[PDB]
Amino acid sequence: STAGKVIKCKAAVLWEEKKPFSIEEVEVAPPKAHEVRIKMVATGICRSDDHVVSGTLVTPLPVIAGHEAAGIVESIGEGVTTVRPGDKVIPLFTPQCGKCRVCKHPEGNFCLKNDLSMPRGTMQDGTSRFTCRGKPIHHFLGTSTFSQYTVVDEISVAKIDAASPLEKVCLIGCGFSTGYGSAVKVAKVTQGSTCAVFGLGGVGLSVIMGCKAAGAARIIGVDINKDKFAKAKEVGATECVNPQDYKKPIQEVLTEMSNGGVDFSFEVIGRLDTMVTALSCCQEAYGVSVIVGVPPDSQNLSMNPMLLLSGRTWKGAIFGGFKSKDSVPKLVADFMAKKFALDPLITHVLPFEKINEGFDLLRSGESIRTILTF
Amino acid sequence: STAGKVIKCKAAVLWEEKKPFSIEEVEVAPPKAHEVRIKMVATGICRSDDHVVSGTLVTPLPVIAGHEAAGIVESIGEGVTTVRPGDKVIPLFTPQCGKCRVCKHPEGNFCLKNDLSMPRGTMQDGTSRFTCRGKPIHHFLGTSTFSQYTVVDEISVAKIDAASPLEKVCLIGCGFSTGYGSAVKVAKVTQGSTCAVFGLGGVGLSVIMGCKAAGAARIIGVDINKDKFAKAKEVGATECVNPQDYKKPIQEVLTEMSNGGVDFSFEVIGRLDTMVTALSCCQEAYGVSVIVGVPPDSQNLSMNPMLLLSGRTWKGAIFGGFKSKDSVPKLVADFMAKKFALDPLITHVLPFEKINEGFDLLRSGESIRTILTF
Numbered sequence A, B: 001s002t003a004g005k006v007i008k009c010k011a012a013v014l015w016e017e018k019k020p021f022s023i024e025e026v027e028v029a030p031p032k033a034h035e036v037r038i039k040m041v042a043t044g045i046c047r048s049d050d051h052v053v054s055g056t057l058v059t060p061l062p063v064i065a066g067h068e069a070a071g072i073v074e075s076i077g078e079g080v081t082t083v084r085p086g087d088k089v090i091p092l093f094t095p096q097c098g099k100c101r102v103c104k105h106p107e108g109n110f111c112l113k114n115d116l117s118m119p120r121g122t123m124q125d126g127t128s129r130f131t132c133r134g135k136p137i138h139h140f141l142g143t144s145t146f147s148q149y150t151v152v153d154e155i156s157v158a159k160i161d162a163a164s165p166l167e168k169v170c171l172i173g174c175g176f177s178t179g180y181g182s183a184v185k186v187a188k189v190t191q192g193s194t195c196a197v198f199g200l201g202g203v204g205l206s207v208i209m210g211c212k213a214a215g216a217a218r219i220i221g222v223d224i225n226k227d228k229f230a231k232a233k234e235v236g237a238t239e240c241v242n243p244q245d246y247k248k249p250i251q252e253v254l255t256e257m258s259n260g261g262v263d264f265s266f267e268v269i270g271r272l273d274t275m276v277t278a279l280s281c282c283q284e285a286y287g288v289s290v291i292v293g294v295p296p297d298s299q300n301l302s303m304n305p306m307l308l309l310s311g312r313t314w315k316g317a318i319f320g321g322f323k324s325k326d327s328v329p330k331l332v333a334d335f336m337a338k339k340f341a342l343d344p345l346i347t348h349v350l351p352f353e354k355i356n357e358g359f360d361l362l363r364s365g366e367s368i369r370t371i372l373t374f
């Protein structure tokens, strides 16, 4: 009944850096050509949403953030062919156009239509579907899931299994897939290897799950919050280390523990110093280090290139290297077939209107993923 | 007739940084257990030897430098099994002990017995076989080929074909194998790809040869010395670019020429700034950049890790990634079957006694490889 009409609903608007989210009455325009309007069912709180608040990640304000979500298609614009009203969907913060050089490459996933590299905070057409008191509100990563309803470009949504539990599979929209893919697809962890994972939040726990799936023999978790260690061990870490416990740098500790360096390391925090530490702790001749965490805007790291000359490989990726529209439905099917677990990532469930409590939980160190429900 | 005896012979001794080599009489001890004494036939002048003179590359002085060479075994110490007197050999600046975790790894080649990481300038046993003016003189990379005779550990020498032309195949001891392998083994250049090669000296020309062998569609040579371009095109470059000809930074120029970034880039100079430029010019989602050049001692580069987070891979390697003792004889056999060419690398030939003129030819830009004959 709402098709082709403006919807008035609630959304969490970020008006200013370093402020709480403000629950506002917003107007959500109907979808234009090749757009899809989605009724939200569940959305996770990811550290990257917090990075918008903290100024770590720069995107145009005011904004409706949120990017890790699942919902049901309310309506489709002209020319949409990949979803229909009533379909369960996951919005894709990294699109898959299918036509750019990256989409056509076997390995590449950072589609050229992304809004990550040079954020505009709009739909593909350069406009917004959201107003608050007549003021346009920016989109975030072409998703904007902290709203009862959102509009996304067709290249930024995937149809998923009709029977999937949206309150769990929302994590496939970001954290789970990112960490898991970073292990299994980007690093290509090998059986019997030794892995070190820096950061034991939702993404890092998903890296651990991927290293375990890949058959790693040792998975060393590293975090300054020792409260994170029990869950890390539950999902496959063989050992955990707190850098604060040592009188020496942790790269030296990990090199000694691993008898000369790890096979694979992962930076899953977003600090420059830990990126260099994680590179250094992999074995100098054949080690691989993958950057997953997102650091503060515009800051360069300093490193000695001899770390690379000896033979190390250093790489990064977005969304675990997964081609998003192809991969999301397959990951949901794998979940439904019991190939991996999502419940270990979910520590809190709150109604949407308690969004700020959810962020307070993340910032305090107490949660992994809070799922917001509608 | 010299077996078991100290040999008095000529060598090029480097007493101090930023001074000419001194050709003078040295004493060369006989080989101890598991060591091999070699009569030099030919040695190339590699930019790395110049780096030792300049202080870019730190190694203990005084020293007998030289590491790209071929010769004939004069005598063997007790226990040597892999070469015999009269065998043609190439000394290996990267050893292959066969026993350490790196040697056992399928992809590693930076054997833990190397003298590169923390140079001592000795034999494996921590002593020197060279005396000059009554003083011990350091070895260089376990090779020291700027001498009529040298002594090397058995793990630092490979037996080659008895019919090998030593005045050509000395380049398999460093520059050819390094560049070729950086393309074919480390980057794994693919058929139909676009490559950019920064630096068109002997190593960069060898990278081009490897890219061409791998079936690259486009190979863009980059050098500030346009006199290098003609030879780069002869060996496979499809285009050459001089950064000094352009108002834009060369990474922008290359990204444009390649319709969004190259598949593979190679830094084959030894400058921090070109390492970051080369990384930048590869395609942000799936590009690979390999560091080959050696930059000034102890200096760090500065870079933005967003360059990696989008999907780039950055790596480096010593000796083209080749496991040295296994690979060198096979490369020589391939050269004898005319699978690649060395003559394009050899621009000048001089007697050993004219070593300082050879270094002048390199420093002035005029040469690729000068081969010194004994």
Ligand SMILES: NC(=O)C1=CN([C@@H]2O[C@H](COP(=O)(O)OP(=O)(O)OC[C@H]3O[C@@H](n4cnc5c(N)ncnc54)[C@H](O)[C@@H]3O)[C@@H](O)[C@H]2O)C=CC1
Pocket (backbone or CB within 6 Å): A046, A047, A048, A051, A174, A175, A178, A198, A199, A200, A201, A202, A203, A204, A222, A223, A224, A225, A228, A243, A268, A269, A270, A271, A274, A291, A292, A293, A294, A295, A317, A318, A319, A320, A368, B309
């Ligand atoms: N590359 C990509 O596609 C994606 C990247 N991200 C990024 O991944 C990172 C992790 O995200 P979440 O797991 O949601 O975050 P999180 O905040 O839940 O987890 C980070 C962990 O790092 C630990 N930590 C913080 N400082 C540390 C230090 N100095 N040393 C050791 N441990 C430290 C924390 O205690 C925490 O447990 C964030 O930077 C986020 O923006 C997240 C998803 C997608």
Ligand SMILES: NC(=O)C1=CN([C@@H]2O[C@H](COP(=O)(O)OP(=O)(O)OC[C@H]3O[C@@H](n4cnc5c(N)ncnc54)[C@H](O)[C@@H]3O)[C@@H](O)[C@H]2O)C=CC1
Pocket (backbone or CB within 6 Å): A309, B046, B047, B048, B051, B174, B175, B178, B198, B199, B200, B201, B202, B203, B204, B222, B223, B224, B225, B228, B243, B268, B269, B270, B271, B274, B291, B292, B293, B294, B295, B317, B318, B319, B320, B368
């Ligand atoms: N990784 C390894 O195992 C090995 C590394 N090396 C290193 O590889 C590098 C190259 O060695 P060679 O080919 O013998 O040296 P080379 O000096 O003959 O060639 C370097 C080229 O770079 C060009 N160049 C200088 N500054 C430039 C700039 N700003 N932009 C563009 N081009 C520039 C020069 O004009 C020259 O043609 C050296 O740093 C050497 O130490 C060499 C062999 C082994």
Ligand SMILES: CCCCC[C@H](C)NC=O
Pocket (backbone or CB within 6 Å): A046, A048, A049, A057, A058, A059, A067, A093, A115, A116, A117, A119, A141, A174, A294, A318, A319
């Ligand atoms: C402004 C770009 C931010 C992208 C953040 C991260 C890669 N995505 C999801 O957490």
Ligand SMILES: CCCCC[C@H](C)NC=O
Pocket (backbone or CB within 6 Å): B046, B048, B049, B057, B058, B059, B067, B093, B115, B116, B117, B119, B174, B294, B318, B319
């Ligand atoms: C003291 C370490 C120098 C290594 C130099 C380079 C990798 N080898 C030959 O050119």
Ligand SMILES: [Zn+2]
Pocket (backbone or CB within 6 Å): A095, A096, A097, A098, A099, A100, A101, A102, A103, A111, A112, A113
């Ligand atoms: Zn695309």
Ligand SMILES: [Zn+2]
Pocket (backbone or CB within 6 Å): A046, A047, A048, A049, A067, A068, A174, A175
């Ligand atoms: Zn996220």
Ligand SMILES: [Zn+2]
Pocket (backbone or CB within 6 Å): B046, B047, B048, B049, B067, B068, B174, B175
């Ligand atoms: Zn060399």
Ligand SMILES: [Zn+2]
Pocket (backbone or CB within 6 Å): B095, B096, B097, B098, B099, B100, B101, B102, B103, B111, B112, B113
């Ligand atoms: Zn070894």
